[PDB]
Design a protein around this ligand. Sequence first.
Ligand SMILES: *[C@@H]1O[C@H](CO)[C@@H](O[C@@H]2O[C@H](CO)[C@@H](O)[C@H](O)[C@H]2NC(C)=O)[C@H](O)[C@H]1NC(C)=O
Ligand code: NAG
Length: 497
Amino acid sequence: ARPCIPKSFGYSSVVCVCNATYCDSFDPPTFPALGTFSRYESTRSGRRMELSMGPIQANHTGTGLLLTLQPEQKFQKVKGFGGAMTDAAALNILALSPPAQNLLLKSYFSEEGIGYNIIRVPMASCDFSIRTYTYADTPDDFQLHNFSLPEEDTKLKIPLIHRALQLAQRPVSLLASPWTSPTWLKTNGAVNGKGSLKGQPGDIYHQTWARYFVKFLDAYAEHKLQFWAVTAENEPSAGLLSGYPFQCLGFTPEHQRDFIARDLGPTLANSTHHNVRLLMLDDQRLLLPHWAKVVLTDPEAAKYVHGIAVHWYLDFLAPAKATLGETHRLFPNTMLFASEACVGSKFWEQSVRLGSWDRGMQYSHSIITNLLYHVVGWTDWNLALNPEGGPNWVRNFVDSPIIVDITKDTFYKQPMFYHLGHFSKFIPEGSQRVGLVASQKNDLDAVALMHPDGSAVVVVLNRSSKDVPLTIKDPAVGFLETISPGYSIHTYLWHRQ
Ligand SMILES: *[C@@H]1O[C@H](CO)[C@@H](O[C@@H]2O[C@H](CO)[C@@H](O)[C@H](O)[C@H]2NC(C)=O)[C@H](O)[C@H]1NC(C)=O
Ligand SMILES: *[C@@H]1O[C@H](CO)[C@@H](O)[C@H](O)[C@H]1NC(C)=O
């Protein structure tokens, strides 16, 4: 419908400039006849999800890399894709004029945008907050009669989530994660640093903390929002590190195991919110498989855990086979879900790099690795930041796919936004990953999935400078002869009948 208005900030590629009256957007999707494919292309050179169509033909003219679809080789079903409604994201969005707010939310949540179907909601304050509150800061309130939602929830987050859900045709799944308990439940009496819950699982501190989850779900339910899932804690490993600067709550895998078994599992099960799923870990993938082995080999905890939430810092190395691969092999019936990703966290990398193709490539590369190792969903961090990567009460350190400039009522869509969109827009909930066999060693990243209705989607990422000639074979339809340009990402779609 409307193309990218590009702007360079001196990095490897462009952002797409949006304001109160103009944002780039797509027409309603349109699937062509058997024997025709659709292709969406983004390039470092500046193409942004540009649509073309071409033939799937009977004869194979390619002599290079062949990728063969193997629809009978079936893997995980996809839960979906989205991002986090932090205090920071909400403050940034709501500082735009209402028409620019509309266009930002449509970018993420409408069929004319990239069709997000997942929102992660912090339970009270995190580093991406302007202050350090919880829902129950009055001490010695073990029954949580003084539990309440502040302005950050009732004026910023909840109205924005309502607007996100109105724009989305797809059902949206909400995921909740806490950073800290009230400080009077904690060994260190503080929101951050090395500190766990007081006492031991089963006791009055552990039971109050479990009840705080139910209180949160009740308050959100009064505002007509229902959660798909909650995590047991955001980054439980972090609250064991002395001088950890952000809101945290420390758990050893043994303490998470017993907290779920004795307190959180039973408390949610006995509540009106018993259908809400519980994810464990919500932490870096180098804690697997050890963390899953500790929690899931205990039947009294394992019966309450629907899945494992993993984080990754895309700046760092983590071998997927030894972590995600091994966890799947040991616990093949407990879904893996990427609950948080971000980039820029290294000292020498600027927090926000407007138009960084490399950061885009890190997003798409990480989504393909995840999908190739059984992960069912991928959730970005902050939906939007300011050009300094804020607000953050501790320190700005990561990027965001949308950067808001309130002084100009403008927002910038980064390459990360398009690299995410090449998946989120074209892989609806219930899509299943299927085989895609490479005929020979190659430098592309590729993944194939089948839509619920049986149609094919293949994403091809070229992180090299060299054009790669490519053929895709669908045994049912024929040969797609294509080129993966250097520093490109392609999404291919086609009917199989
Ligand atoms: C919002 O962005 C749009 C698109 O860049 C701007 O629209 C244009 O306005 C210029 C100068 O006024 C015209 O010559 C162009 O033809 C317009 N382009 C399009 C494609 O409509 C608009 O200026 C921006 N709004 C503000 C207040 O800067
Ligand atoms: C709740 O807040 C009120 C008003 O400040 C306070 O007086 C009361 O002590 C709190 N209630 C409980 C149960 O802690």
